[PDB]
């Protein structure tokens, strides 16, 4: 397939779960590690 | 008893030459004994002796050290007398602690240098506790049992000024200081031969590794200063009074009393420098210490 | 704050860590060997007496452990493994290609502070001796120390021994500002 | 997996004994082991504890200072001595292995037990709903139990456990934390609760489900069975 | 829109470990951990409360690799020896007790990674790679096609396919069922010592030796390069984030780095570690990233 094709999708994959990202959003301190 | 106060000039730097070494042997031990208990890297069996004596010498700064300053310069008790039983037996042990606890530490060095290959064996935590337990027990039961019960002063009264009020000090007679005497010189002579035999090891090592006096001169001298350094901190604080005391004892008290207490500051003193020799000369030490300042 | 169980799983992590110091008190007094050397060195291993072999040989109340494969294949990777060894243990019996391999291994990124045994498996002996130093001479200076020797024999656990006592002295004779 | 018994018989009261419980084929040093007594008309009960390595010995608050408890790890055998014997300690004793990890299944095997005959504080009570719920075969059972205090700690976990004894046989584990299945136990058994109230739940029942249902609670140590309840059939 | 400044700080510290550290995996409950040691020890770690659930004994000291099933019930390891070690732990006693002993390889082993409860993939130093049956010892299949000895392997979410790289600067992509070479991309200048893949399943991040992360997509293409003047050294490890935003890197620096997927620039730093990084985890919800090196220590931030 198309390389522009190949990155459009994995920009819309990336953009469609970073809304469940612990990593990128800190997660309010329900923290498991916390402190 | 309105003992003559024996005021000095104007010129009392002393004030600004003795408690610079009761801050030192205060604040740089208190933080050589963090230094071996927050981090768990240091953990090492040779490191509990250092902290024994670090401890047993910041007892020292903490409680001895500024009432002796101020007896010192002042030449007048101002305290009570009836710390002076007390006072007396505090120094007489902790001074002694730490010479045996300096004669383990060669001990253990001359260990780890002679036989490297089976010394972790040799050497582990017990016997560091076992050198620790023996050397307080020592300076203990010597302290007390010859200071406290007062049996040090059986027909000496002669030195006008154990017999007056708000006057301290501790005028060994003539059977006693031959048993202060020997507790002195046996810690000696073993660290002296050991750190001999270190040396010379060090210096056959040198000649191995080259191979030129050009070369081995500069290892000589770099394995001499540092065992040179530690012997002479020890015997010219060490040595000064000793001589003093064997001296007075068989001679009839001939010593005024305004260079005894600098004499005494003389063995007093080496609590200062013992940290800045054994903890603040290596660079592992000298890490911890930079971490510990600053805000981590 | 913790339940009945909850201490219980705390008393077995410290009876585990209490196995772990115990394991570590034998663990840091046995000293590993790492053997080398080429298929024509004749490599000894059977005289002191699956992708890798060890042989345990006690000398004077001490215990080594000595490691060399044998069914691997480039170096380049499973050499990392090897860099918190004693010594490396390397045997010779030709020249320069056993030479190269002995630059290469000397001058290696993560070989660096270990020192090398090198046997040696009157005027010609000495030629190759001094070969095989003028590499460990060239670089190195203060960590390596290479010890060359002139080995065949029943008394080659003694050398070893005699080494490794070496290089302990000198490490701590190094960490104590005495040399 | 092998525990068994030796001691009782009959004593004079205040006298002594010693009831050993030797174990093979399992890993003896790793496990904590209870001892859990049943009168021979009544439900229940514990006695005695020890952990793993002898660092935590607990005992009821009925015989804190009358027994005691010791394990030889070498010789893989467990015992305790009693003295001064009461009328009250007439029974059957059982050894139970106990393995605490995240994750493990405390009180997941029972041994046979011996009987003794004896000649002539704040806790939990859990009671049972019903003591005799007979129910038909192939029918589904929803036996109840409540609790004097939550069972369930900050941490998430309830600490509810189930044991079945069987007619003959000492009681086996089926429900550990009230969501976990024990190895042996089929799907048919099911737990469920909120805090307070327990249930257990049946689905179909063969000609081996009979049997007496005991409840557990484990948050604050001093802990009590129950009567429990006979399922008729 | 870019990510910005992302600060991650050490939330527990797994001491305990004799000697260094290659390899760790991470359970599939997101709490239990296993570590491997140079002094012959898996660890287990309960991670929120820092215990130690088991501490078994290895029997050859040079390990390479760690795995945790999916189950939890086994854990394999492997190294120098040739031989793949599985250790059962939900057995009927109380102490962990080896299961099977694979010994079909020549090299040394690398990796290898649980696909079922009695399937495995291992990847050796004999530049091949190979399925076993636990049951049955064998390999049902055996690929080829490597010249370089393999460092590293990951599969995929789906788990019909998983990508090897090797030490010959390129990464295959393998058949589980067919067992044949399907695509091979070669995008590096070095050998490559990590591979992973992304949470799509359609593209994947390699990492080698001259300090440059590569990402791959099944457009048969490399996509971006991650580098900088700065960093020389190789690269240890790779692995990505729950979203795939991230992607996280291990260095021979001590400094691990943190990479953005689609801008492809620079975004935290993970420093901390006295030595260098080894091994990089990171959980399956995505709320924690373990990390450990070679002095012995583990370490876990959010």
Excluded at chain 3, 153 to 174: K, S
Aim: charged share 20%; with cysteine; net charge neutral.
């Amino acid at each position: 397939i198309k390389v522009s094709k190949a990155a459009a999708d994995l920009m819309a994959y990336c953009e469609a779960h970073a809304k469940e990202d612990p990593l990128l959003t800190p997660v309010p301190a329900e923290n498991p590690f916390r402190e | 008893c309105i003992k003559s106060s024996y005021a000095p000039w104007p010129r009392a730097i002393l004030y600004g030459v003795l408690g610079l070494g009761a801050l030192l042997a205060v604040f740089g031990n208190l933080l050589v004994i963090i230094a071996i208990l927050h981090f768990k890297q240091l953990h090492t069996p040779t490191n509990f002796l250092v902290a024994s004596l670090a401890c047993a010498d910041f007892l020292v700064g903490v409680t001895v050290m500024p009432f002796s300053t101020v007896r010192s310069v002042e030449s007048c008790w101002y305290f009570g007398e009836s710390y002076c039983k007390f006072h007396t037996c505090f120094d007489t042990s902790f001074c002694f602690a730490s010479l045996f606890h300096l004669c383990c530490i060669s001990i253990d060095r001359y260990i780890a240098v002679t036989d490297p290959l089976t010394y972790p064996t040799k050497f582990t935590v017990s016997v560091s506790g076992l050198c620790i337990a023996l050397s307080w027990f020592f300076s203990v039961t010597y302290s007390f049992s010859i200071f406290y019960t007062g049996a040090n002063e059986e027909g000496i009264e002669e030195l006008v000024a154990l017999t007056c009020v708000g006057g301290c000090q501790a005028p060994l007679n003539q059977n006693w200081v031959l048993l202060c005497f020997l507790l002195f010189f046996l810690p000696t002579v073993v660290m002296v031969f050991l750190y001999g035999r270190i040396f010379l090891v060090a210096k056959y090592q040198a000649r191995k590794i080259e191979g030129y006096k050009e070369r081995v001169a500069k290892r000589e001298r770099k394995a001499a200063k540092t065992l040179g350094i530690a012997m002479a901190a020890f015997l010219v604080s060490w040595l000064p009074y000793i001589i003093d005391a064997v001296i007075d004892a068989y001679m009839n008290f001939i010593t005024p009393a305004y260079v005894y207490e600098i004499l005494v500051w003389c063995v007093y003193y080496n609590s200062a420098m013992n940290p800045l020799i054994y903890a603040f000369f290596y660079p592992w030490f000298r890490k911890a210490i930079k971490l510990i300042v600053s805000g981590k | 704050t913790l339940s009945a169980e909850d201490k219980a799983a705390v008393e077995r992590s410290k009876m585990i860590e209490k196995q772990l110091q115990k394991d570590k008190q034998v663990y840091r007094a046995t000293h590993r060997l790492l053997l080398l050397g080429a298929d024509n060195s004749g490599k000894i291993v059977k005289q002191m007496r699956s992708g890798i072999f060890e042989t345990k040989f006690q000398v004077d109340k001490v215990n080594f452990h000595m490691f060399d494969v044998g069914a691997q294949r480039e170096r380049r990777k499973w050499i990392q493994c090897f860099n918190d060894v004693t010594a490396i243990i390397f045997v010779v019996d030709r020249l320069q290609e056993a030479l190269n391999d002995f630059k290469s291994i000397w001058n290696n990124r993560w070989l660096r502070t270990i020192s090398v045994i090198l046997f040696l498996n009157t005027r010609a002996k000495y030629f190759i001796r001094d070969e095989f130093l003028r590499i460990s001479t060239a670089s190195g200076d203060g960590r390596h120390y290479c010890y060359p020797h002139f080995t065949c024999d029943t008394e080659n656990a003694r050398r070893i021994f005699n080494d490794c006592r070496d290089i302990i002295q000198r490490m701590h004779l190094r960490q104590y500002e005495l040399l | 997996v092998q525990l068994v018994e030796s001691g009782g018989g009959l004593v004079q009261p205040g006298g002594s004994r010693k009831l050993s419980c030797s174990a093979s084929g399992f890993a003896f040093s790793s496990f904590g082991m209870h001892w859990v007594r049943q009168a021979p008309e009544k439900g229940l009960e514990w006695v005695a504890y020890i952990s793993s390595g002898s660092g935590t010995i607990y005992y009821a608050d009925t015989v804190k200072g009358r027994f005691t408890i010791s394990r030889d790890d070498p010789k893989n055998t467990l015992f305790l001595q009693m003295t001064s014997l009461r009328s009250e300690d007439t029974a059957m004793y059982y050894c139970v292995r106990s393995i605490y990890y995240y994750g493990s299944s405390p009180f997941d095997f029972w041994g046979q037990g011996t009987t003794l005959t004896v000649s002539a504080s704040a806790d939990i009570v859990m009671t049972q709903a019903t003591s005799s719920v007979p129910v038909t075969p192939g029918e589904s059972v929803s036996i109840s139990c409540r609790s004097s205090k939550s069972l369930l700690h900050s941490n998430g976990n309830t600490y509810l456990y189930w044991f079945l004894q069987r007619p003959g046989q000492s009681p086996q584990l089926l429900i550990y934390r009230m969501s976990n299945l024990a190895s042996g136990v089929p799907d048919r058994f099911s737990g469920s609760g909120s805090g307070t109230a327990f249930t257990l739940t049946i689905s179909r029942l063969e000609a081996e489900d009979v049997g007496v249902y005991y409840c557990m609670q484990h948050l604050e140590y001093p802990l009590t069975f129950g009567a429990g309840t006979k399922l008729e059939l | 829109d870019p990510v910005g400044r992302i600060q991650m700080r050490t939330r527990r510290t797994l001491r305990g470990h004799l000697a260094k550290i290659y390899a760790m995996h991470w359970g599939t409950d997101s709490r239990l951990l296993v570590s491997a040691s140079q002094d012959g020890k898996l660890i287990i770690w309960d991670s929120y409360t820092t215990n130690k659930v088991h501490a078994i004994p290895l029997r050859s000291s040079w390990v390479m690799t760690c795995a945790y099933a999916p189950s939890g019930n086994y854990v394999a390891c492997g190294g120098l020896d040739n031989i793949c070690s599985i250790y059962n732990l939900k057995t009927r006693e109380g102490n962990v007790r080896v299961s099977r002993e694979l010994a079909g390889h020549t090299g040394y082993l690398s990796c290898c990674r649980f696909l079922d409860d009695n399937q495995i993939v291992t990847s050796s130093g004999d530049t091949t790679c190979a399925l076993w049956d636990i049951e049955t010892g064998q390999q049902t299949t055996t690929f080829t096609g490597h010249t370089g000895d393999v460092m590293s392997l990951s599969l995929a979410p789906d788990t019909r396919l998983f990508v090897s790289g090797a030490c010959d600067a390129s990464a295959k992509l393998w058949d589980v069922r067919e067992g044949m070479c399907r695509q091979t991309f070669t995008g590096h200048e070095s050998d490559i010592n990590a591979i992973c893949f992304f949470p799509n399943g359609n593209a994947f991040a390699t990492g080698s030796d001259d300090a440059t992360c590569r990402l791959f997509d099944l457009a048969d293409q490399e996509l971006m390069t991650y580098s900088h003047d700065n960093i020389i050294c190789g690269i240890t490890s790779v692995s990505f984030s729950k979203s795939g935003r991230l992607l996280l890197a291990g260095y021979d620096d001590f400094n691990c780095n943190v990479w953005d997927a689609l801008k492809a620039d620079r975004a935290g730093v993970l420093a901390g570690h006295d030595n260098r990084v080894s091994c990089l985890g990171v959980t399956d919800d995505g709320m924690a990233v373990a990390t450990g090196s070679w002095d012995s220590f583990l370490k876990i931030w959010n």
